[PDB]
Write a protein that binds this ligand. Sequence first.
Ligand SMILES: [Cu+2]
Ligand SMILES: [Cu+2]
Length: 463
Amino acid sequence: RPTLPIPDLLTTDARNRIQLTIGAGQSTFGGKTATTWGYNGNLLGPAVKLQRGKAVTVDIYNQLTEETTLHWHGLEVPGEVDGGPQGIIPPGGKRSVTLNVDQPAATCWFHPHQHGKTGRQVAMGLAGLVVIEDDEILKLMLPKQWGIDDVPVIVQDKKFSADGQIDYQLDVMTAAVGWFGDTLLTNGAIYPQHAAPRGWLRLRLLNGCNARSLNFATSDNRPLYVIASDGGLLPEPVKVSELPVLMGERFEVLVEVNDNKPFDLVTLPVSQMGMAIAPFDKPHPVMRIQPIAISASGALPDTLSSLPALPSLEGLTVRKLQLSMDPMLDMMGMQMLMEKYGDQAMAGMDFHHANKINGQAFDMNKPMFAAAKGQYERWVISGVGDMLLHPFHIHGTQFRILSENGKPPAAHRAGWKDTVKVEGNVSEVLVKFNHDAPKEHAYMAHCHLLEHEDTGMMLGFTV
Ligand SMILES: [Cu+2]
Ligand SMILES: [Cu+2]
């Protein structure tokens, strides 16, 4: 097996600048070349290291022949640097942003947000990581040797045509059920191995799929200890036997490594339409962990952080967001899925503006509302009316889940989140925006099933 590719950990230079070049190159999958896009390389991207309380300037050079944007998913930053669809970077041009980092330690990520094309641009290879550090986390003495006992694990599916190229289409079927493939990548490699020292191994897990939900576990059923969600540390570790991860979500887990006992990180079949077709009808390996007989220094502390109680809900502004899909698109798309793949597409379970929030397909010129700055609001997001999965993401914040799809959140999901599950039911989140966003650079709120976002399931809002 190939070794797990380890993204470079990138910090500022003497001018306080980080350079990111967006460009086309080539990658090899199963022996066959494909055109791919990457940040500072051919595919995927570096891990940008940020420090709470410090500002960094990022110089972003678009060397593609089409327009793109660069969005920092999970970062609490003003709209002007948020890199939503209004944050255009012309082909052959450059945009610079200054990020004033003001949130706790977390694994965030970055990716394109081009209007109507975010799914294609992510599918072509663009994604990178953000590692935010703070003073609190350093004192815990977690595993922290990058590429050794602290590793990022970006998991993505793709499908390829016979000629070896990535086979991306936004069409009636994918607008309805999402773009998904038959090949699983881990930091861009197929089923890599990672050598790890005896003791604790920290995995920063990102579901970077367009549409496919994941469910992590180990091949020999050793537990995962969840220590962090999208927005940072949980108050205490939470032991789990499996870990569902929606599109765009991150979790950090610790797992024990013992001499002479290799095991695989795997993903278990999910109950999502289209996602349990071979090879994903069965547990699917993500990466092999190969124990090395050298002692690892990291700890799993009993206490990680302090999590504040939920405040009172009385008096808070309520904003209701009703997700919907044109009945026609939903029917046509699902029929096409069933015709192609049959019953296995439900195992365990104009289209360009067909998906909507509050009856409206995304209008970039018309933010739907102006949210308060520095005030808690309660946002109620409903998927009642269809049975599709909508991981709902809100820019400019780390929120607390009050109810996830009609039930209180599980413990590992009760901390700081930027995504909430919505699937045929109603979710409620407690959100606060610390930064402004004007109409010309609005925050987005949308489904992170990228084909739904690109066909209208997104709104802009100001702060
Ligand atoms: Cu985001
Ligand atoms: Cu959706």
